[PDB]
Each structure stands twice: as C-alpha cells, then as structure tokens.
C-alpha cells in the first residue's frame, strides 16, 4: 500500500515534504523514492531519497507549482502524484 | 571525485569481440544509470545503449541493437558493455557516462531524464583488418 | 539534428545555437560542452541554465521543433562543439544532436 505524501514546510525556495505510511507494515523497506519535478517544462527530476518519513526539498523555484510522487524503493507501488506550489 | 573509469578497447578484428566495462567510484551506484556512447573520431556522438543496474533494464540503440549486450553489477559498482559481431562503422572512441535515479523516473516520466551529469574518459577501440 | 553545424562569431557576440526535434511531447533538453580533445561536459541544470555561480551565460529555452542555448557575453573558454540530447519516451533510447562548432571570426 503506497505511502500517503503530504505538505508543512513551504516556503518561497523551499517545499518541505511528508509522507506516513502505517506502522503495521512498517517493514522499513529500505528508502523512500521522492520523485520530484517542475511542471511540463524544465525536465531536471532532481529526485532525492530518504528512508525517513520527511524531506526538505531545497533549492526550488518561486511561484512554481512542482509536481511530486513518493515511491516505495521496491526491492511495490508508488504513490499518487501530488501537485504542490511554492511561495 | 565521482568517476566513471572505463576499461577495455584495444584492437579486435570485423567479425571480433571486445567486452567493454566501467568502473564507478565515488558515487552510490545501482541508482545512476549507466550509459554508453560513442564518440566516432571526427564526426560526434553516438547513444549505444543504457541500464539501471539495480533494477537492470535493458536499452539499446538501432545502430547497435543485438550487436551489444549491457550489463553490470551493483556489488561490483561497475557496468559491463559486451561487444560482438563487430562491424567497420563500430570503430569509435567509446564513452561511460552517468544517468539520474527514480525508478519512477525511468518509467512513467522517463522522457523528462536528467542529462549525463558524470562521463567517463574514453578508450580507444578500433576494428580493423 | 541541429540546423547549424559550423558557426563563427566574436567574443561578447551573442550567438544562438539551434536543434531540430522529434516533437512528441516537450521532452528533456540537455546540451553538452566538448572541448576539443577533451570529454563531454554538462553545462549545469539551473533553471535559466548557465556553468558558474548562478550566472546566465549559456542559457536556453524551447522554440517550436528545436531547442536553443543562445549565450549572451561570448568568453574565450566557451569556443568548442555542442550537443543536444533528448530522452525518447519509446523504448528508453538516446537521440543526438548533429553537432555545432563555434570559431572565432578573424
């Protein structure tokens, strides 16, 4: 079951991103994949990871709806894709 | 300080066989994808073939195609470019060169692909008769 | 593909550099810096896209079938041959720009 990403930290460079998978399954399966991007435009992923639960995407562009997925490493699934705008 | 130190070339005769292969220090492999391309003395470049080595997807260029066979080893932290049934045109100065990550990336979106951020450095590899 | 292959200009000149597409969807456009004699290497992903602290330099943008990386203030450094690379989203394949060369009008 994907993980469920969400937003607290945004900022006019910064988005910073969370996501909760449910304890239960909590396998720690190695890494999560954040698979970042801007919109139909400039490609550069960017793409970070992390086996926490929160990252701090830096170095983002103003005024700039980047679009963001969350994957489960998978050594199943990846989350939704999720839109989010900085400020 | 990330490299992509290649190996192989030398000298293989139309009809031969040269396994090329790459090193990798400094960065965590696996991830970057490792890719080959040719620098053909005097014209320009030339996209043999790609892989994700963790995961291990096959991708090969027309020119080329079953010709080569790409490969590598995530233990190793090092690609592998099997060269067969070698032609005149295959004479080029072959190039390593890293890719970005997201196995998402590679699929769904992979037609928005980060450049090769890290390349290698170039063997010769001529086949003549 | 790229409409130019050969150019020559100045230093401080802006120039701009072209290269032909296969369209689809606007895809990925990575150009490469080789210095002569040298190997491939990445300008930088920057957003304007430049090689320095921040700068614009080489900067580039979409424009129809091609794609440009007009510079603005040419240095002595940047005279070398470029390309640009895409990302085909058929069976995870590379296609490559013809090549440009710049040289210094004498």
């Known amino acids: 079951e994907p993980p469920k990403v969400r937003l607290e930290g945004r900022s006019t460079t910064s988005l910073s991103v969370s996501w909760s998978i449910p304890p239960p399954q909590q396998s720690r399966v190695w890494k999560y994949e954040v698979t970042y991007r801007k919109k139909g435009d400039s490609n550069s992923y960017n793409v970070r990871r992390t086996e926490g639960f929160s990252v701090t995407l830096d170095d983002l562009a103003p005024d700039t709806t980047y679009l963001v997925q969350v994957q489960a490493l998978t050594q199943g699934a990846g989350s939704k894709v999720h839109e989010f705008q900085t400020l | 300080e990330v490299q992509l130190v290649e190996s192989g070339g030398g000298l293989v005769q139309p009809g031969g066989s040269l396994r090329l292969s790459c090193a990798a220090s400094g960065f965590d492999s696996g991830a970057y994808l490792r890719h080959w391309v040719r620098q053909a003395p005097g014209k320009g470049l030339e996209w043999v073939a790609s892989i994700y080595p963790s995961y291990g997807y096959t991708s090969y260029a027309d020119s080329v195609k079953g010709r080569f066979t790409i490969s590598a080893d995530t233990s190793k932290n090092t690609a592998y470019l099997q060269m067969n049934s070698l032609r005149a045109e295959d004479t080029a100065v072959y190039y390593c060169?890293?890719?970005?990550?997201?196995?998402?990336?590679?699929?769904?979106?992979?037609?928005?692909?980060?450049?090769?951020?890290?390349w290698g450095q170039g063997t010769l590899v001529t086949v003549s008769s | 593909t790229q409409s130019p292959s050969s150019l020559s200009a100045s230093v401080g000149d802006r120039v701009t550099i072209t290269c032909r597409a296969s369209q689809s969807v606007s895809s990925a456009v990575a150009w490469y810096q080789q210095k002569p004699g040298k190997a491939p290497k990445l300008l930088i992903y920057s957003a304007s896209d430049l090689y320095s602290g921040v700068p614009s330099r080489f900067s580039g943008s979409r424009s129809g079938t091609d794609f440009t990386l007009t510079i603005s203030s040419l240095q002595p450094e940047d005279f070398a041959t470029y390309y640009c690379q895409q990302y085909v989203s058929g069976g995870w394949l590379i296609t490559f720009g013809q090549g440009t060369k710049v040289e210094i009008k004498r």
């Open positions: 060169a890293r890719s970005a990550a997201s196995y998402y990336g590679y699929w769904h979106w992979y037609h928005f692909s980060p450049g090769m951020d890290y």
